[PDB]
């Protein structure tokens, strides 16, 4: 590389290199290895004939710091013409014959020419070429090396050992510090005998035939195409091609007015149903109330203690059948769970986990005997009634009124805490004070929400089920549902929701499915909205005493049973649900920061402390309603949680298309006279991304309700 040569040699040696190259007719940018070779040869030549003078008596001495012979003649630094002239003059005044090529140096003492060679390969092979090139004449030749070797004819090293050691050390150091940078390989692979070649690369074969078939249709060889590309000048091509093009190719703008947009069309059919892992609005808890502050125990015994505090069991019976399957199996499963939980006392030693018996009804519920068998296609070639796969068009379902009810209930406040975060260091800088105040207000507003309870429930259940799946692999294990919280007075509490029975878990990859059955308590009668529960079988198990108001009254208790099987990936998806809190905080902070830039001040106090501010977040037959900042915080948190709980591609598609439409509508509202190229296609995409899911349909209804108000 050029910079290496510039910083390695002194300018006196460097200057002659360009003069040598200019006469030859080369370049320093395209060719670099030849530059280094020439510089090295010149420096070695000058170092070989320095500090050497001969006295009048004929002896040779070495001195430093009168008119004595210098014992050597420099030839390399001169152009070709006077290089021949000086050799002719000396050979005439000494009677020597013209050798052939140019010798490098001449010695008065021995009256013979010397050639100096520096090679990158080993010395032995390089001596023969020089020996054959020059013959039948008196000319000593000396060869150095980059690894500390040398070789001279007749083994007559006409020099002191120190001078040779200096050259060898210089070459060794240059080689080492050039290899330390990444330049030795190319330099070594550049000597083709007695010249220097930068690189070599040819097609020469099958690649030539492959190349000749990768051209525009009016060419046959690569060379002709290259020549045509090289001899190209742009005259008028684009203008002519545009002129001879039809006018049906165009992009006409149609304006977007106030009367242009239309409501989105929603599908019709039978109503939709519930498909969450655990039910949300219709759950109750059996509290153990306060545990001892030092009590950290196994979940099984916590569940048993929670169970003991209840009296009021009855004889179970079915109030809503599954209309697909066998319900007596569900009854027998519940009875078996209760009996096996009671039968712990018939054991010498207390177990840590409970493994259920492999019974007929449990085997039916977990699907252990509907496994197809796998054989090769050759034997079953002639069989009949064979279909490709479940390639069936998805069913279309309409929108009901229970999802809005769930969302309404999810935005309310409770009497517990559900989350307690750690501490950080004390604050010094003002920006730290601002950040602390923002996050403290947000945390105080969203601490008691129900969505936090949903988050904690999901985290606990998924973690427990993943641990059980990884630990016990061939057993039917019983897993309780448990959450923890702090009461208003300051007492810890433990809650129980139900039970889960797990099947067989032999999971090699992240797609394999493990089946399970779930049981949950409730006080909601299933016969008020039968269409909501379509994958459930509901039993009646007992009565509950309510202490609310004056007197005591009894209400029935129910149980919800269902078969399901999730994943290994979706377990990990469920174990991370605090990112919803992170996202909500980020959204609020972004809204504050956007407004802080227009009104160039700090607007965090005008958002929270002010009590006269209202935001439109609701709808009613009267019109659009308003709320406070805590309400919008809880609404955003609930929206994030429900997005996490109902993931599907339809959500992604709808979000993208609705974002585009919302941006266009805002541009219209800002008096910027917008326009569109194809408005029907955007809609058509919106409806084709609207097949079956209830959350997506609710979002579409919300968008329609927004559209009917923003332009009226």
């Amino acid at each position: 590389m050029e910079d290496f040569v510039r910083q390695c040699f002194n300018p006196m040696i460097v200057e002659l290199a360009e003069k040598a190259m200019k006469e030859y007719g080369e370049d320093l940018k395209i060719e670099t290895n030849k530059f280094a070779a020439i510089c090295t040869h010149l420096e070695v030549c000058f170092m070989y004939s320095d500090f050497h003078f001969i006295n009048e008596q004929g002896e040779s001495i070495v001195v430093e710091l009168a008119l004595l012979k210098h014992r050597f003649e420099i030839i390399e630094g001169r152009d070709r013409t006077m290089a021949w002239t000086v050799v002719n003059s000396i050979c005439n005044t000494t009677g020597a014959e013209k050798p052939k090529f140019l010798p490098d140096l001449y010695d008065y003492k021995e009256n013979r020419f010397i050639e100096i060679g520096v090679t990158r390969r080993e010395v032995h092979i390089y001596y023969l070429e020089k020996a054959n090139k020059i013959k039948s004449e008196n000319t000593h030749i000396h060869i150095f090396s980059f690894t500390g070797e040398e070789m001279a004819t007749k083994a007559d090293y006409t020099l002191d050992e120190e001078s040779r050691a200096r050259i060898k050390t210089r070459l060794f150091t240059i080689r080492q510090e050039m290899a330390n940078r990444g330049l030795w390989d190319s330099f070594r692979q550049s000597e083709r005998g007695e010249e220097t070649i930068e690189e070599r690369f040819e097609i020469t074969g099958t690649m030539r035939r492959l190349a000749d078939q990768s051209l525009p249709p009016n060419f046959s060889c690569l060379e002709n195409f290259r020549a045509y590309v090289d001899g190209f000048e742009p005259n008028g091509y684009i203008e002519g091609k545009l002129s001879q093009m039809s006018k049906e190719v165009n992009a006409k703008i149609e304006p977007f007015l106030k009367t242009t947009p239309r409501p989105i069309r929603l599908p019709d059919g039978p109503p939709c149903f519930q498909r969450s892992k655990f039910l949300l609005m219709d759950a109750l808890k059996l509290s153990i109330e306060d545990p001892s502050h030092e009590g950290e125990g196994i979940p099984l015994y916590d569940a048993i203690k929670c169970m003991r505090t209840f009296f009021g069991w009855k004889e179970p019976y079915i109030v809503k059948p599954h209309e697909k399957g066998i319900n007596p199996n569900y009854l027998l499963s519940w009875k078996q769970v209760l009996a096996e939980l009671q039968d712990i006392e018939n054991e010498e030693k207390i177990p840590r986990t409970k493994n259920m018996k492999k019974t007929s009804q449990l085997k039916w519920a977990l699907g252990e005997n509907m496994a197809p068998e796998k054989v090769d296609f050759d034997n079953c070639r002639d069989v009949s009634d064979l279909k490709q796969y479940d390639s069936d068009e998805p069913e279309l379902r309409s929108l009901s009124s229970w999802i809005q009810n769930e969302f309404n209930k999810a935005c309310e406040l409770t009497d517990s805490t559900w989350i307690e975060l750690d501490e950080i260091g004390e604050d010094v800088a003002p920006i730290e004070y601002i950040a602390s105040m923002r996050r403290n207000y947000f945390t105080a507003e969203v601490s008691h929400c129900r969505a936090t309870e949903y988050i904690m429930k999901g985290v606990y259940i998924n973690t427990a089920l993943l641990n059980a799946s990884c630990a016990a692999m061939d057993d039917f294990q019983l897993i309780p549902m448990i959450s923890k919280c702090r009461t208003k007075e300051g007492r810890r509490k433990t809650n129980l929701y139900g039970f889960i029975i797990k099947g067989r878990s032999h999971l090699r990859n992240d797609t394999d499915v493990v089946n399970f059955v779930s049981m949950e308590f409730s006080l909601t009668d299933p016969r008020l909205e039968p269409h909501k529960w379509e994958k459930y079988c509901v039993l009646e198990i007992g009565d509950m005493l309510l202490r609310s108001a004056i007197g005591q009254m009894s209400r029935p208790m129910f149980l919800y049973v269902r078969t399901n099987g999730t994943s290994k990936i979706k377990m990990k998806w469920g174990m991370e649900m605090r990112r919803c809190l992170l996202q909500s905080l980020q959204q609020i902070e972004s809204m504050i920061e956007a407004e802080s830039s227009v009104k160039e001040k700090d607007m965090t106090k005008e958002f929270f402390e002010n009590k006269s501010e209202t935001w439109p977040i609701g709808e009613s037959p009267k019109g659009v309603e308003d709320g406070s900042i805590g309400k919008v915080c809880r609404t955003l948190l609930a929206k994030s949680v429900f997005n996490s709980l109902y993931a599907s591609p339809q959500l992604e598609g709808f979000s993208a298309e609705s974002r585009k439409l919302l941006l266009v509508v805002q541009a219209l509202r800002d008096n910027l006279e917008p326009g569109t190229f194809d408005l029907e296609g955007l809609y058509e995409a919106i409806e084709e991304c609207l097949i079956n899911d209830p959350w997506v349909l609710l979002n579409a209804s919300w968008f329609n309700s927004f559209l009917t108000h923003a332009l009226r």
């Binding site: 002194n10 320095d50 500390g148 150091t173 510090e177 003002p430 920006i431 990884c470 830039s597």
Partner: protein
């Protein structure tokens, strides 16, 4: 003893012999990269599962002579099947254990200890909310050392930390950098680690720059607090506050005795010759010097031989 017997059986196998004989020292780092590419099997879950087990970490054999098997509670601290130990052992060591002086720490980690001094003795100002435009410059995150380029920093580090593996250059020059003497004098009996010391010295002495979208100060002091000063729509004002001459005659000779080490050239003589191992494997014959061989005007004096 163990290393040579491990080397002996590698050349017994024919496939490894070709590698060991056909690969130069210059190509060790090339073949070092051929290891693997698939390990990320959810490390967080793996660590959570491993911390549940008893005896999850490993230690040397001599731990059994320094830490008791059980504590006052009666809990096992280590077990025998390198041995297996528990985190309780680490906590016990931090609670009860031998003490040593830590006087060498503030000289090995001083680049970290200057940051806290800068931060504690600093003052703060007001914060402004507005909009601003940020442009890019060349910023220096490691100031480095004055009067020292990147070429000699590596030389200094090699001399200080690995005195027996220097070669060619540094061994033929006639000089001695001042900073090397103080670094070698101070770090006389430090037993922390050669590699940690090497990395810390490299971080202290070597300058390196990058591109950043800075809208404020340009010096190295203002770059390390760039996350505290700037923002999307705000700016915070803050001031910090505050080796003899040798030559190579050729390769090894069988008529001048066995090879020596670099640290054993001290005895030497006034012009004898002996072979030594320099760098990472090369053995060469060297001899002491008799003249100066400097870089003075004598190089330019050759111009008298040209342009007469």
């Amino acid at each position: 003893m163990e290393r040579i017997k491990e080397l002996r059986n590698l050349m017994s196998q024919s496939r490894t012999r070709e590698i060991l004989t056909k690969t130069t020292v210059d190509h060790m780092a090339i073949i070092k990269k051929y290891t693997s590419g698939r390990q990320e099997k959810n490390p967080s879950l793996r660590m959570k599962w491993m911390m549940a087990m008893k005896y999850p970490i490993t230690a040397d054999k001599r731990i059994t002579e320094m830490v008791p098997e059980r504590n006052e509670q009666g809990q096992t601290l280590w077990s025998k099947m390198r041995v297996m130990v528990s985190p309780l052992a680490v906590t016990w060591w931090n609670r009860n254990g031998p003490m040593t002086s830590t006087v060498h720490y503030p000289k090995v980690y001083k680049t970290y200890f200057e940051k806290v001094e800068r931060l504690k003795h600093g003052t703060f100002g007001p914060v402004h909310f507005r909009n601003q435009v940020k442009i890019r410059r060349r910023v220096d995150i490691n100031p480095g050392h004055a009067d020292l380029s990147a070429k000699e920093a590596q030389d200094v580090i090699m001399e200080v930390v690995f005195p027996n593996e220097v070669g060619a250059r540094i061994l033929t020059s006639e000089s001695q950098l001042t900073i090397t003497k103080e670094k070698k004098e101070e770090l006389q009996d430090c037993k922390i680690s050669p590699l940690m010391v090497a990395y810390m010295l490299e971080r202290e002495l070597v300058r390196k720059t990058r591109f950043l979208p800075v809208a404020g100060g340009t010096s190295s002091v203002y770059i390390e607090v760039l996350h505290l000063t700037q923002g999307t729509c705000w700016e915070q004002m803050y001031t910090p506050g505050g080796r003899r001459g040798f030559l190579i005659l050729g390769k090894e000779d069988r008529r001048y005795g066995p090879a020596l080490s670099i640290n054993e050239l001290s005895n030497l003589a006034k012009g004898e010759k002996a072979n030594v191992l320099i760098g990472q494997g090369d053995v060469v014959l060297v001899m002491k010097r008799k003249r100066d061989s400097s870089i003075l005007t004598d190089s330019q004096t050759a111009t008298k031989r040209i342009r007469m």
